[PDB]
Symmetry: D2
Subunit: 210 residues, 4 copies
Amino acid sequence: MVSFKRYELPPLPYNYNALEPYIIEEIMKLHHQKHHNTYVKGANAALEKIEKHLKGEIQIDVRAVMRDFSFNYAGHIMHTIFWPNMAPPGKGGGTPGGRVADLIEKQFGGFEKFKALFSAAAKTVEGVGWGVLAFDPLTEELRILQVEKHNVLMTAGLVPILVIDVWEHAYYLQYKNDRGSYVENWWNVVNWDDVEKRLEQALNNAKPLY
Amino acid sequence: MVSFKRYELPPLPYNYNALEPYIIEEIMKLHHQKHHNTYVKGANAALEKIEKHLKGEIQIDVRAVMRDFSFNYAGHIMHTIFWPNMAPPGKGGGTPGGRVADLIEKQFGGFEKFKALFSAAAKTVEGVGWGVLAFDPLTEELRILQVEKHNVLMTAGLVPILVIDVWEHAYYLQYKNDRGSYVENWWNVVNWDDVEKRLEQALNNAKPLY
Amino acid sequence: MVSFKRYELPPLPYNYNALEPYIIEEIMKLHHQKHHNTYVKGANAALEKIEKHLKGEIQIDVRAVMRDFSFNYAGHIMHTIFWPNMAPPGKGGGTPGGRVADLIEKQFGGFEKFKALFSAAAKTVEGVGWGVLAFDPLTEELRILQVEKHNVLMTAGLVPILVIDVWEHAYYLQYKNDRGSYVENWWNVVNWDDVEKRLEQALNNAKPLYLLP
Amino acid sequence: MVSFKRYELPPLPYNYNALEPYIIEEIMKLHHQKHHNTYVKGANAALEKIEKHLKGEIQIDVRAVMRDFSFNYAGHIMHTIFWPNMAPPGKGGGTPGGRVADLIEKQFGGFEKFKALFSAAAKTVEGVGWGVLAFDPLTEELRILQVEKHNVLMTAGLVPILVIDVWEHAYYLQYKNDRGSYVENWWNVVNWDDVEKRLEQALNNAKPLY
Ligand SMILES: [Fe+3]
Ligand SMILES: [Fe+3]
Ligand SMILES: [Fe+3]
Ligand SMILES: [Fe+3]
């Protein structure tokens, strides 16, 4: 038995204020340094308990520790995708090209219509959660869904390639209750290059994965 | 637009009575022909609604339809993994070798410790759900977790390689309320070569996705 | 400190085979002696942990232990209402009268419309759960809802007066996957006298719990 | 048939700035006028769909509409309890007497032990939700629990007599990520007069409902 590899906080791919005016520095700071850090620490702490259990040192509530692992792992991986999904206005914003634009044209009937559907998915998350654009390994097509918290409504298989955090902490300081305006403005920092790089990996690796 | 690719019910890799005496024919029949078919039909039905919305013919409750998609897609993919995860005793059962056994030693301290943990995870799912052995693309390590329903507690990233269905319909006609005995018996039909193939694909393809 | 009062498994109000042919003896036996008993034990086990935590004897995961309490307490109270909600065919079945019929006409446009809606609610629970007819203390009207597991989608305030268990263990041995047939057959053992009494209590007692008199 | 009685947004028992310095005016105002109002509308909108369905005027997804009703009704009743559970500091805060103090002594081993447990329950809500002190009709005793969102982990029977909102919108503008500090400060505005009156009604009324 070798000890588990610890999860690590991935640094932001841009400065804390690089997403202004659309997302303010203070949100980015809090979001990355308080919130994301906590998921990393929480996922590791769950695995530490599992380890002490396996080594016969303690007897854990397997369901409880696994619920802790699930929520914190999911928070960790969802944000790890969230950050590079965005970029400073210029590098971020506008409309996609390449392979992403092609499937969006094919599945959703154009960016316009995709954007409307994704925005509606994000805006209408009940409570806190995510709007998610995912690659389906079973059909090699794009799917849009919601995730509640970090780990509710998410499924096996589906590979998130573009996600928006619609937890209240993601916008409240700036947009107050107005999640709709947040989602509208988030489009101006979407890093279509990062998304494109993900659809590439998925088209190559996801079906041959399942 | 191109109309979404439909999901389809996979055939079982063996006859309905082939996992006897561990899982009786009537369960396998009902489970595949009734339950799994419902998920295929529901996942498609959800995507038909999204299509009509995209064609501008109807307006949908995006949240509601994506919850339907989520549950049925999850049910479909989880069962698609579940069937080939099992095999008629001989091909099914026993103790794993290869890379599966290798990381089972590294992560869990051996087959018996792993078996005990996986079994406890499976047995203690609250309500209906799944015990899941998954490959973590962020650490390239095994993780065990539970899923409730098909689409609760599941996270992005984690690739399920071995799953056990602990919904009541999976065992009740034979084991009645005794999920524990069903879980103990299920080990005798696990298709470890299938699990091995899945882990190999996961080691090859999963990490370069996130 | 004296701490907590324990939950106990109630007896059924009738023999295990008393709801036949609509619900078979085997289901009633397993459901009561194994499933319901398990919730009683689970709720008590959670309260024992909280106790030890409060005495400083251990330090629990409060979230985890409260999740266990929630699920098992909910299972216990839901089955506690479920059993007397039914009665052997004769006392059970048929159509309600009294205050329940009055509110069903007002809220739902009659019994046939109510039945169609309640049945749809029960039949379409995603995964395992309950169909629930409840009294709303804020409006003193009936409401129908679903509950998933025992403790998901349930809200504060609403007082369940008629519930149907649509967990798979409630019907599978007899109806197999055909939850629809089970739901249809279940109407034949509804104890409307029990539902009526619950509504009487709700009309008298529920509103003041929330809107102070 | 009679059209349903609509839910209405109650006024607060005090002005938006009356809970300062513990909860700032801007939070109280947004929380009441935006958040609570939205639940009232959401619960009414779900009931209207049910009505139109019953009148044979529209098609509904019964599950979806009932999920909408559940969430919004729950948000409404929980905030309806939340507001009078608080009072301007002076009338609010301090230490309970009467029947509430008596049960706190007998069950939790006194106020400080109760406060520590309730605070722990509130602080550790996973995602958004509520810390709840409820009266249990089966035992005529107090119980503590968490609720996630407004309508997850709540059970039948239990009557909330004291609740704390730990949705991020309840604290984020003032306390940022520091929910712990919010929970600690909230004790200074607890209206124990209100809690005592709720308990007295529950002692009188709750058990016979079941
Ligand atoms: Fe976040
Ligand atoms: Fe299944
Ligand atoms: Fe049951
Ligand atoms: Fe709130």
